[PDB]
Each structure stands twice: as structure tokens, then as C-alpha cells.
């Protein structure tokens, strides 16, 4: 099993003076950190959110981010002054940074940037570059951003070394929560007809849900999307379209790792 660690920053710039930056950090589908614009500090959302970093190593890393947030905010504002009137407020910037861990001691890091909701810029190798489809005017900010050797060196060290080391640590400290098994609970209902099988409370996310006449799997079954619950478990429903009157004989069967072979079966 491969985990993706994701630091997700969202920044809104309304005009020349108003601005807010918020971040969430994810390991797989679990939240590890929260950093609200309102807060001077980054909040742990798990007891193990510090990984295997000493208090000193953490205070130091946080301080670097604290300053980055202020730095980031002013740099965007100066960059808009360089482009104007070409580009104008309100502006949305999103960042998606982190690494994907692999078997052995292998990983892969990324730092993706989106402007007004379109993916345009990444850090690759030793420099910022625009991605295919990006507007040409971005070449000025790229050139400006790439003159900053100190930021380059830092980001390279953040992506090649810091991420993987830190995420390894999280994987150890959070093993208990990462490998938790939570049992689904299922129930049935209908609208006009259309039968609905509700599945809720399960973790992890791989789940099998099929409507069945006895032991023949109904072809018509339609799974919806995975919807989150507040307690970090999942919710899924599978609907089957039928002719009114033949609701008898049909069953909902659910397979999930937490059950340990005891499939859930429900009849209408």
C-alpha cells in the first residue's frame, strides 16, 4: 500500500490589500494538520501528527512556514503589480505539495500550483516551470521566481529530503490509525421504482456492494460516490432500478475487510 502525503494550500486575494491563506495536510485520506488563516501556528489533528521529529526540529520547521506564509502573501501581491493591468483581482492560488511513498525506501515528490483553478506551474528538478497549456504571461513570474536561488535550494531540500524523512516518521507513529478497520452498517429503502442500499461507517475505503436476486448478481446496480462521515469513515449507496411488484427476492450484499468474511446480506 502506497500513501500520498498532501499539503494543500488555498489562498484568496480579493483586492490590493485583502488576503487569506488556509491549509490542510492529508496522509492518505486522513487529516494530520490544520492551519487556519486565523492561527499563528499549525494545529495537529492527530496525536501522532508530529511524526518522529523532536520538539526542536518541529518548532524550527513551523517557524519556517510561519514566515513563508507572510512571504508568499507579499510576493503574490508584488507579482500582480508586475502583470497589471493584464491580470487583476480577485485571484485564487492553490498549492499541492508533498510526496508519495513506495515499497523499500523509494518516494516521489511534487509541488503543483494552480491559478484561478487551473494547473499552470510546478517545481521540477531545480527550478519553477510552467506546464503545457499555461498562458505565456506566466513566463515573467517564472523568470522572477527562478532568480531566487535561496528559495530554490530550500524547496529542493524540502522535496528531496524533508518530505520523505517526515512522512516515514508519520507512517510509524500513525500505524494504529492508518490500519484501523471499521465495520459498515447497511440499510434499505426505495423511491418511485428504485431500491437503495445504504452502506455507512466503514474504513478503509475499498468496499464491495452488489444487489442480488438470491445468488445472481444484478447487472443494473449503480454505485454512487464515496461520501465522508465526520468520524473519518465512509458512506456509499448502490441503487437498483426495478419494475414495481418484484421487490421480493432481491438482496443487498456487502463485502469489506472489517467483517472478516462475514458478508452483510439484507432482504427487502
Amino acid at each position, epitope marked *: 500500500k502506497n500513501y500520498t502525503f498532501r499539503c494543500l494550500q488555498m489562498s484568496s486575494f480579493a483586492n490590493r490589500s485583502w488576503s487569506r491563506t488556509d491549509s490542510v495536510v492529508w496522509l492518505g485520506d486522513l487529516q494530520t494538520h490544520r492551519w487556519s488563516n486565523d492561527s499563528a501556528t499549525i494545529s495537529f489533528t492527530k496525536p501522532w501528527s508530529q511524526g518522529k521529529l523532536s520538539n526542536q526540529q518541529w518548532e524550527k520547521l513551523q517557524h519556517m512556514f510561519q514566515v513563508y506564509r507572510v*512571504s508568499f502573501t*507579499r510576493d503574490i501581491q508584488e507579482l500582480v503589480k508586475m502583470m497589471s493591468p493584464k491580470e487583476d483581482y480577485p485571484i485564487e492560488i492553490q498549492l499541492s505539495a508533498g510526496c508519495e511513498m513506495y515499497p523499500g525506501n523509494a518516494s516521489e515528490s511534487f509541488l503543483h500550483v494552480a491559478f484561478q483553478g487551473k494547473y499552470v506551474v510546478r517545481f521540477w528538478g531545480t527550478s519553477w516551470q510552467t506546464v503545457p497549456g499555461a498562458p505565456s504571461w506566466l513566463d515573467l513570474p517564472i523568470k*522572477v521566481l527562478n532568480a531566487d536561488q535561496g528559495t530554490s535550494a530550500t524547496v529542493q531540500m524540502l522535496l528531496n529530503d524533508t518530505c520523505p524523512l517526515f512522512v516515514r516518521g508519520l507512517l510509524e507513529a500513525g500505524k494504529s490509525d492508518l490500519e484501523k478497520q471499521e465495520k459498515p452498517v447497511a440499510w434499505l429503502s426505495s423511491v418511485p421504482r428504485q431500491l437503495v442500499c445504504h452502506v455507512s461507517g466503514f474504513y478503509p475505503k475499498p468496499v464491495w456492494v452488489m444487489w442480488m436476486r438470491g445468488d445472481q448478481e444484478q447487472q443494473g446496480t449503480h454505485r454512487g460516490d464515496f461520501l465522508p462521515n465526520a468520524d473519518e469513515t465512509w458512506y456509499l449507496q448502490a441503487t437498483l432500478d426495478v419494475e414495481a411488484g418484484e421487490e421480493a427476492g432481491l438482496a443487498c450484499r456487502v463485502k469489506h475487510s472489517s467483517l472478516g468474511g462475514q458478508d452483510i446480506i439484507l432482504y427487502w
Partner: T-cell receptor
Amino acid sequence: TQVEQSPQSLVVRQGENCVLQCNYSVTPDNHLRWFKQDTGKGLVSLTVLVDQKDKTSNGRYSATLDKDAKHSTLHITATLLDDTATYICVVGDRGSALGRLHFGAGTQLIVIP
Amino acid sequence: AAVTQSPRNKVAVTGGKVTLSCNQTNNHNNMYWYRQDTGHGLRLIHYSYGAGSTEKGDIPDGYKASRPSQENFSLILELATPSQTSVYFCASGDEGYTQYFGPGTRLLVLE
């Protein structure tokens, strides 16, 4: 303010060495520059220090920077009369044009011939 | 890489109109105006990121800037006042961090 220099002024006999201090709170601190300004003239750059712990030299001028302490010194060896001037400390908060320079008010040096 | 300023020195009256000019041929995008008064470091008045625009620095009040072209950045004092007595420095630069300073302009504004 964010950049403090000391001493405010000093008087030195030709041939004596002296040392000028600059302490700052600027964040971040990408690089530190020392200028020399003759009375009435303009700003001649002496050196620029850019590393966490750095040392530079330029003729009879040498300089140290410590980013941990946010402290820099400028050493003049064997002062000449031409060294009579204002020495100015300037910190840049970026490694590019997105930055702002933060100027100290300077240290006034007089060399007695 | 050279920067020039004119006039180099100017006497003017309160209510008068003063224009300080800066010229730079290095093909630099960026230009900056500062004033230097004793007991203070240089302070940023106005700056410019390219031919055609101008931005407020830290002490913009009493000054208007104008960037008509890549080579020229000028600082306009519409209604000159004694407190604008000072030495003024212009600078240019590319995308890197070094600024290149002009020689300076002494301005005295008498009542």
C-alpha cells in the same frame, strides 16, 4: 527600526584598525550589503554577504555575517584618510526583485591624518 | 551598469513644481526612488516594474511618479514644501536582487 548600526560615529587615527556593527530584525534575511558614502557623493558597494555564516574581504575591508544572530561586522584594517565617510548597512529580504532593501542609518567614521 | 540623475542639485520655492529625472540604459525593468535624510536610512518613495506603471513605496505622500518609458523614471513634486528638502537617489535593476544607484540629487525648498 529593523536595522541598527553601531557605533553612531567614531574618530580614529590613520593606521588604526576599526570595526563597525550592524544588528537587524528583518525577516527573512536573504543578503546583507555594506555601502560606503563620501560626504556629498553617493553609494559605493563594498561587499555582499549571502550565506548562513559568511566571510568576505575587499582590499583592506573585511566582513562577517551571522544569520542566526542577525549580526554583521565590517572591519577596516589600517585606516587611510580616504576612509572618512558614512558606512551603511543594508539588508535584503529576498533573493530577487520581489524584495525590499532595509537601510540602516549608518556609522560616521573620521580618520585623523 | 550606469544610472544618471538630473538635475544634480536644485533650489526651489514652496508651491513650485519640481521634476527629478532618472535615466538608465541597462534595459532594466525596475526603477526606484528614495530620499535620504540624516538620522534615517534611505526610504522608498515610489517604484516601477515596467515602462507604463508606477507603485507606491513606503512614503509616497507629496510625490507623484511617472514611468513613460523603459529608460526613464521621474519623480514629480506638484506643490513643493520645505519638508521635501533632501537628497534623492534613483536606482534600477533586473529580476535579481542588486539595485544600482544613481549619484543623487540635492533639493532645497525655500519658503
